Design a protein around this ligand. Structure first.
Ligand SMILES: Nc1ncnc2c1ncn2[C@@H]1O[C@H](COP(=O)(O)OP(=O)(O)O)[C@@H](O)[C@H]1O
Ligand code: BEF
Ligand SMILES: [Mg+2]
Lengths: 93, 107, 82, 576, 98, 95, 88, 107, 93
DNA sequence: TCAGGATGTATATATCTGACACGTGCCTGGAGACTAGGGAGTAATCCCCTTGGCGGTTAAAACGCGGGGGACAGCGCGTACGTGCGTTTAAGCGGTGCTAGAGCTGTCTACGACCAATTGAGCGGCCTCGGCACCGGGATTCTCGA
DNA sequence: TCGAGAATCCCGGTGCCGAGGCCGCTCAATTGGTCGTAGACAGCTCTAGCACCGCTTAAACGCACGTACGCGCTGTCCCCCGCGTTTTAACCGCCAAGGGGATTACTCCCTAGTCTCCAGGCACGTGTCAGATATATACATCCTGA
């Protein structure tokens, strides 16, 4: 049985922000439950937005509006900025 | 041709493919677009980068090079927006921000 | 094996320490029993939700995941345990 | 085709006459005429028109039939109602209970012609707070009176009372106010129980589009109330000009005349007198100011909502109607020299005013509401030409009081402000002369409605009308559409003008000559700053041309100019 | 005379001490026996993982800490430094928990 | 003249008796439009939407004054004060 | 004044001392301090901003210029306060 | 054979078929069992029957034969369990239960 | 466009409980939003229970446990009783 | 403690209407019938994590005992809010005029589901080694009685 | 305003168990192709939303005035804190039994899917009465004085 997690990814991002700082296993578990939490939130709001507008497909627009609903203020603005840049670079190349 | 990961195309460290799978099998909608895992993975990268940034700053302020749940409690609750997002969250081994009401102090 | 008077196992110094962390300076002598009642109610709720989850899965063991789904079920999200 | 309406609606005329209780004969079958007035009428002069109209409506009375008065204006609907009841029930003596309802703009007026033009018929009015009413319908609660004179909304609030008693003959005024049958007034007039005889008075028929010809002839008549949805395709006449005008216009409109002859009645002032001095209608044009004109392209470029129509009407009239603009122009908002130098309407206005007061002839002006009339008060107070003011929110006390303040010939005030909608029906004046209209008739029936308040029976002066419009603006396009509509009903109401006695040759006379008029404005479809041109309007004789040269040694001779930071800053604050 | 602190100083030093650390303030075995007793009334013969009991201890202690924070806000709003049961049940009445 | 506090109680019974809306339409609608101007310009509102905001707003303020009354009465005072309001909003977790 | 109006108090002031007074009478409040009014206006403005930003968000997502009742219902249910009778 | 509605088989007044459709197209799970719409429709019937019962009793107590939102507000809030379920609900045109704190009454 | 609702069904149940009592249209709308609300709650909890236990099919057991989670006390007991009786009679005949 | 008046509040009858209850034509979604297949039930085995017990240590809890400071009652002052009245004033209702965008349809096409082939990123098991817990001593700081 | 002294910070030293890197070993992520279809875009209709004014009147606003209550101050007493002493149950470390979670192999039958057929339910009307409103009349209650 292989149970996957986000551990190595939070580790990589941590080494990007603070290359000299490590993280304990418990804090890694907290980060994992955080990523799963926020993921289920944005996915749920995307499902609601897709159901109310009568569409069967989740696109970047529904995820964008969901981010603008969940994240207050600057988290929403910078989050939509980073995500839009990521989809931009993704489909451009 | 040599297969290149979609996470490397957009410049994301998070598994765009895994997020896409979770959106497909998560019973969210019947169909999933091609920009949803990229955009969502980017948002998660921003949030994780911020919370780990504040956690690293708190760890550096406490003279500890290893992040502990206390540094996550402080790093979150000291920030206004992350406190508004996580206000309903109970972090294990977090503790409480040091606080005393000014009326309780001697004079 | 009937268990009784175990809520009295919660000690006056314990609740006192919880209030010391909560920012309380001075405590009245009547806080204790009421705090025990409140804690018992909370545990009745969370434990009935978790035990409900465990009954639905036909399992005899209450996993930490069931407790996490009960707390998130009530609106209090607990990170770090899964 | 539809002549089943000819024979079947003539037999239906028999159905109203006997069964309810040439169209010149079978509909009018009960005949009479008398050129003598009823004995109750006192202090009035008898002309020919209200005779034929008098026993014409009496001919509608004896046959048990309704009707509409299609006449121009100034033919004394009040006279026909007074002499109507006083003659009819001078004979029969029943004399009541009878209902008459008029706009609140003129109420004590109608009682004033119920005062001097005849006694012996009492009146029940409704005005003011509920207390005076409590006195009135508390005294008359037992229902003894000759006539009730009321207004619109008091049958809506007092419909719980005055509709309990039985009525016979009602008089409702200004059918254009009636308009739609979907309006609450209409459907609540069925809550009014029943009055056998009816009538409607109007200075002009309904809107150019005319879907509501239904509503009209439903409230006017038993005729069409059975089938509501019928005529909407039969309205296609108004909406190969020879062939389309032929089939649509000539066919359908010949049908409309064929059916509608013995209902509407219209005449002119030249028919009864010829004392009408001129056609008494002109227009003018104006210019703009660059600091204001930038609002056209910039503020039209803003495209927040509904402004595009609202923005241009204001800025060509006043910049100061906008609060922020007036604040940024000057902080002090004191009376200033530049209040009238911002636009051209105030420049040419300051040009005409010395000649206005010079010639000794007065002027009527119509306005939009709210800030426009306020700023005009500020200008007329700035150069200090005294003025009355009138508008919708004023009470009836000073409504009638101000009406009396006009009637004094010694008046030192020439101009004054009056509301198109509120006061357009608000006065009856033989002594006025000049008229000005800014709003340019969102409905033409309102501009021609309030337009005739100048020329009147016994006018010893010569009327001139001015439409003040600025070039390169939406408002002259609104004038374009305005006389486009004047053509639209020009096939309807200008077709309805030759119908009085059901003549024959005059209809094609107005088709060839009037058709030359609509063709003339087909040419029309596709300055005056000097003293002489403006002198030409108000001259009307060489004598006035000579006496206005005394104003040429200052306005022209004069022993700055019209016209940036307000443009950029204005663009900043208006960009919200 | 033996040196004694003025009443209220030790309480503040304890406030700083316990607010400084992450330590759990309730002893394991009594809390576990309490959880088992409360769980007896639902389904008999249940098995608990250690991480589950630790979870109930985390949520319970954090909940009581927040409850004493709001209760302290009530007592201070009453111009008193001593929390009372009516402050507790007041906070639980305003939160909508009763 | 009535003793002070009787008219207040009669008003309590009166307004708690009926379902009537306690805020006038047009001012509340202009307020909603002003607040909405700062988000997206040139917006259209259905009447049922403004009525919805009026229902939720009035009910929210009624509950807020209930809890505020509980705070004032807990302070042994019959007069609610701003510190009671902001106290209730502090305990609810809204700030 | 009469020459130019200057009668504008804006809007949030359009919520009247008697209005808030009535809302307090319904809540069970007996006597009211003079400073409750400004705080109540502030709280009302806050709540209205919180709901309206969400309703306008749902409106912009559908690419519509009209804010309907369903958008407000989904904003209230979005913030945890459920509303009935207007649809859902 | 003549088609008989599944709502009539179990003796339910609610549209078992419609509930089944909403469970299929609601993106809840990938597959829906045969007892879910029947059981769920029955639960909804019990809840609706109870709330309409209390609403009818309140309407009868107020001498009105037509149920109004006020009768739903009273019928719910006067019941403990339905108040616990609907505690987060704001009912339009509901009003408030008449209440006065005993300390505020004169003496 | 035909927009379906629960109106006639709430009407039938009302005529079962109180045959002599009618209902206003607004109260019918409140009942409609109530039925939709509770429906979305039970269906959502059923989706969560089906996802946590790793099953792709919603059966009467998941709906039962969801009812026992959402409805406090006697509403849960009598609700499970009525529902179990309904499935019983359904599959029996 | 107890009677009299004025105000608001409840009751009885009449009346009048707009929303509610019922019938109707129709049509689209629900029921019946049939088929395939994959998910869930079920038997069997493995092991690891739970429960239980026992013994030795000791930090922590219970119990008591002074005493000082805070909860609480009482009292008095002053000022701030209820209450009523005359005066404005916009709210409410209506009615007009325009038109922007909600709402539906009809094509038509890029786009995502789905299956076969392939392989490298991530994971479980497995090794170091060092950042941090723990301790012992000293210097420093904050509290309390002169 | 100051020293005695108890608690705390700081610094140097030591031992360890979890963080961090490596290495097979998959199995899910990537690529390449199809195939049907959701929605993107253009077009058409027409409804409700926007502005504005007329007109009435219930509500808001400003103000005068009284007195109810918030708040400051004081005295009392009681009860909870700070500390010492004594007891006990938590804790840790170890050991042992075993049963319930976890997985895998086999099978079957419940539901998705499609086609066919028809009536349960829905928009649109029609009539019609529950109650909202108005008038008249009497009771409940507060406020006053006795
Ligand atoms: N014979 C007459 N002599 C003098 N004045 C007359 C005569 N007939 C009519 N008028 C004028 O006409 C006015 C009444 O006309 P009015 O009833 O307003 O007509 P309408 O109602 O058609 O507009 C009066 O003011 C009166 O001065
Ligand atoms: F005589 Be018109 F009606 F001015
Ligand atoms: Mg007239």
């Amino acid at each position: 049985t292989r149970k996957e997690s986000y551990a190595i990814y939070v580790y990589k991002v941590l080494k990007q922000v603070h290359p000299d700082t490590g993280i304990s296993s418990k804090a890694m578990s907290i980060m994992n439950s955080f990523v799963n939490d926020v993921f289920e939130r944005i996915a749920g709001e995307a499902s609601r937005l897709a159901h109310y507008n009568k569409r069967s497909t989740i696109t970047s627009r529904e995820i964008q509006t969901a981010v603008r609903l969940l994240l207050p203020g600057e988290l929403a603005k910078h989050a939509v900025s980073e995500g839009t840049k990521a989809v931009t670079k993704y489909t451009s190349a | 041709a040599k297969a290149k990961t979609r996470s490397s195309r957009a410049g994301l460290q998070f598994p765009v493919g895994r997020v896409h799978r979770l959106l497909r099998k998560g019973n969210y909608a019947e169909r999933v677009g091609a920009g949803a895992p990229v955009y969502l993975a980017a948002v998660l990268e921003y949030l994780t980068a911020e919370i780990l940034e504040l956690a690293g700053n708190a760890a550096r302020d406490n003279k500890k090079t290893r992040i502990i749940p206390r540094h996550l409690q402080l790093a979150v609750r000291n920030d206004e927006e992350l406190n508004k997002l996580l206000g309903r969250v109970t972090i294990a081994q977090g503790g409480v921000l040091p606080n005393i009401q000014s009326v309780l102090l001697p004079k | 094996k009937v268990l009784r008077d175990n809520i009295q196992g919660i000690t006056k110094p314990a609740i006192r320490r919880l209030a010391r962390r909560g920012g309380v300076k001075r405590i009245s002598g009547l806080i204790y029993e009421e705090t025990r009642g409140v804690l018992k109610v909370f545990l009745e709720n969370v434990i009935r939700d978790a035990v409900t989850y465990t009954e639905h899965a036909k399992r005899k063991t209450v996993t930490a995941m069931d407790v996490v789904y009960a707390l998130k079920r009530q609106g209090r999200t607990l990170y770090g345990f899964g | 085709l539809l002549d089943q309406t000819k024979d079947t609606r003539i037999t239906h005329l028999l159905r109203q006459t006997n069964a309810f209780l040439d169209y010149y004969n079978v509909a009018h079958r009960i005949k009479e005429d008398i050129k003598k007035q009823p004995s109750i009428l006192v202090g009035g002069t008898l002309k020919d028109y209200q005779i034929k109209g008098l026993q014409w409506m009496v001919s509608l009375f004896n046959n048990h039939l309704n009707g509409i008065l299609a006449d121009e204006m100034g033919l004394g609907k009040t006279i026909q109602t007074i002499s109507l009841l006083t003659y009819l029930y001078e004979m029969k003596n029943i004399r009541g209970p009878y209902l008459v309802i008029v706009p609140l703009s003129t109420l004590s007026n109608w009682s004033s012609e119920f005062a001097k033009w005849a006694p012996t018929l009492r009146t029940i009015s409704f005005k003011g707070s509920p207390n005076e009413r409590k006195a009135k319908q508390a005294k008359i609660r037992a229902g003894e009176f000759d006539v009730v004179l009321t207004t619109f909304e008091y049958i809506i609030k007092e419909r719980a009372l005055l509709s309990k008693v039985k009525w016979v003959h009602m008089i409702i005024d200004e059918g254009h106010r009636m308009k739609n049958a979907q309006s609450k007034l209409s459907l609540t007039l069925n809550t009014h129980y029943h009055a056998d005889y009816r009538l409607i008075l109007t200075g002009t028929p309904l809107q150019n589009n005319l879907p509501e010809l239904w509503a009209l002839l439903n409230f006017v008549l038993p005729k069409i109330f059975n089938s509501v949805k019928s005529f909407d395709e039969w309205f296609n006449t108004p909406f190969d000009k020879i062939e389309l005008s032929e089939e649509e216009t000539l066919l359908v409109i010949r049908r409309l005349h064929k059916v509608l002859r013995p209902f509407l009645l219209r005449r002119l002032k030249k028919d009864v007198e010829k004392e009408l001095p001129d056609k008494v209608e002109k227009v003018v044009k104006c210019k703009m100011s660059a600091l204001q004109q930038i609002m056209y392209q910039q503020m039209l470029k803003y495209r927040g909502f509904n402004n595009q129509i609202m923005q241009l009407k204001k800025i060509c009239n006043h910049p100061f109607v906008f609060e922020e603009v007036e604040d940024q122009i000057n902080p002090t908002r004191e009376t200033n020299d530049d209040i009238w130098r911002v636009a051209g309407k105030f420049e040419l206005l300051d040009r005409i005013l010395p000649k206005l007061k010079a010639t000794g002839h007065r002027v009527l002006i119509f306005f939009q509401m709210t800030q426009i009339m306020d700023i005009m008060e500020d200008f007329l107070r700035y150069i200090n030409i005294k003025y009355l003011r009138l508008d919708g929110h004023t009470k009836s006390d000073e409504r009638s009081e101000l009406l009396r303040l006009f009637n004094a010939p010694d008046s030192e005030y020439l101009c004054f402000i009056l509301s198109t909608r509120a006061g357009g029906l608000g006065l009856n004046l033989q002594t006025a002369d000049t008229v000005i209209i800014f709003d340019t008739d969102w409905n033409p029936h309102q501009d021609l409605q309030a337009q005739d308040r100048a020329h009147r029976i016994g006018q010893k002066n010569e009327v001139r009308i001015l439409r003040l419009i600025t070039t390169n603006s939406v408002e002259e396009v609104i004038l374009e559409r305005a006389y486009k509509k004047l053509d639209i009903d020009g096939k309807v109401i200008q077709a309805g003008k030759f119908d009085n006695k059901s003549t024959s040759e005059e209809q094609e006379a107005l088709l060839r000559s009037l058709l030359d008029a609509e063709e003339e404005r087909r040419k029309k479809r596709e300055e005056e700053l000097k003293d002489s041109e403006i002198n030409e309007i108000l001259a009307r004789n060489d004598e006035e041309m000579a006496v206005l040269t005394r104003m040429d040694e200052d306005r022209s001779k004069k022993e700055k100019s019209r016209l940036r930071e307000e443009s950029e800053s204005a663009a900043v604050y208006n960009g919200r | 005379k033996p040196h004694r602190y003025r009443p209220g100083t030790v309480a503040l030093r304890e406030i700083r001490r316990y607010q400084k650390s992450t330590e759990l303030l309730i002893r394991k075995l009594p809390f576990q026996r309490l959880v088992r007793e409360i769980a007896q009334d639902f389904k008999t013969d249940l098995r608990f993982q250690s991480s589950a009991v630790m979870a109930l201890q985390e949520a319970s202690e954090a909940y009581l800490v927040a409850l004493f924070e709001d209760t302290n806000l009530c007592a201070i709003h009453a111009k008193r430094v001593t929390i009372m049961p009516k402050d507790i049940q007041l906070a639980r009445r305003i939160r909508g928990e009763r």
